[PDB]
Amino acid sequence: SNADDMPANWTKPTKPYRVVGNIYYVGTEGISSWLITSSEGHVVLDGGPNAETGKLVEHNITALGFQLADVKILINTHAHYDHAGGLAQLKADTGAKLWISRKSDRSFGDQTKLKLGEIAMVAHLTPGHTIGCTSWTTAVVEKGRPLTVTFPCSLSVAGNVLVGNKTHRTIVADYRASFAKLRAIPTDVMLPAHEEQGNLLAKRQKQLRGDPNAFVDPTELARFVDASEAAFNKELARQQAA
Ligand SMILES: [Cl-]
Ligand SMILES: [Cl-]
Ligand SMILES: [Mg+2]
Ligand code: NI
Ligand SMILES: [Zn+2]
Ligand SMILES: [Zn+2]
Ligand SMILES: [Zn+2]
């Protein structure tokens, strides 16, 4: 069965940086983690694949000039190890409250609003890969220009049973509804959970060369959903033939 070897870049350090507005990238080369800041405290979304990368996230937060003690809320895209594995370490070292859609401190439902000072975020449940998959949205202002931001879950089909799933019986219908929900979200800035899903490394280089809108592409979430759904369709067709 699945050997769960980790691609090398999932645990490879990369320099943290400001993306847009009050959103900062603090993850690894391959696995995203995001710091969203306010004068009343910060949110961290995802923690990388293990306790060691959770420590790396901590040090990226403080390398950007912020205080770890000011992290107040931890959130998640989906609760598998590659995105959630570092959250327990961050929880222990920050005393922050861990939000997880229904060890967690608060459950939440679809359209839940998270507010912390200037931070306003909205959870959009996007079940499929797991029943708890959560995509997050927010908005920022960058050089006086308003921008909408979406943190989609991974839209993965890795290890999913799509025909005769006895656990998640509605899995195919959930995926298809989640695809539709994500398409219906206007999104100037898509910030995905894996580097290759957003070309984040190359965008960071564009930014260092002076591109002020390197992360802005209002068509990208539609293109990501379309690509994830094509891969979903292919895997579904394979499992149906077998
Ligand atoms: Cl996913
Ligand atoms: Cl994934
Ligand atoms: Mg827009
Ligand atoms: Ni389309
Ligand atoms: Zn997963
Ligand atoms: Zn992943
Ligand atoms: Zn998902």
Secondary-structure-derived class: alpha/beta
Strand content: 15-25%
Bound molecules: chloride ion, magnesium ion, nickel (II) ion, zinc ion
Number of domains: 1
- Total E-strand runs: 11
Assign the CATH topology: Metallo-beta-lactamase, Chain A
State the end-to-end CA separation: 17 Å
**What is the percent of helical residues?**
25-40%
Largest sheet: 6 strands, mixed
Based on CA atoms alone, the radius of gyration comes out at 17 Å
Q: Please state how the strands of the largest beta sheet are arranged side by side.
A: 1-2-3-4-5-6
How would you describe the shape?
globular
CATH superfamily: Ribonuclease Z/Hydroxyacylglutathione hydrolase-like
What is the CATH architecture term? 4-Layer Sandwich
The total of helices stands at: 6
The level 1 CATH classification is: Alpha Beta
PDB class: hydrolase
Keywords: metallo-beta-lacatamase, antibiotic-resistance, Structural Genomics, Center for Structural Biology of Infectious Diseases, csbid, hydrolase
Assembly: monomeric
Entry title: Crystal structure of metallo-beta-lactamase superfamily protein from Caulobacter vibrioides
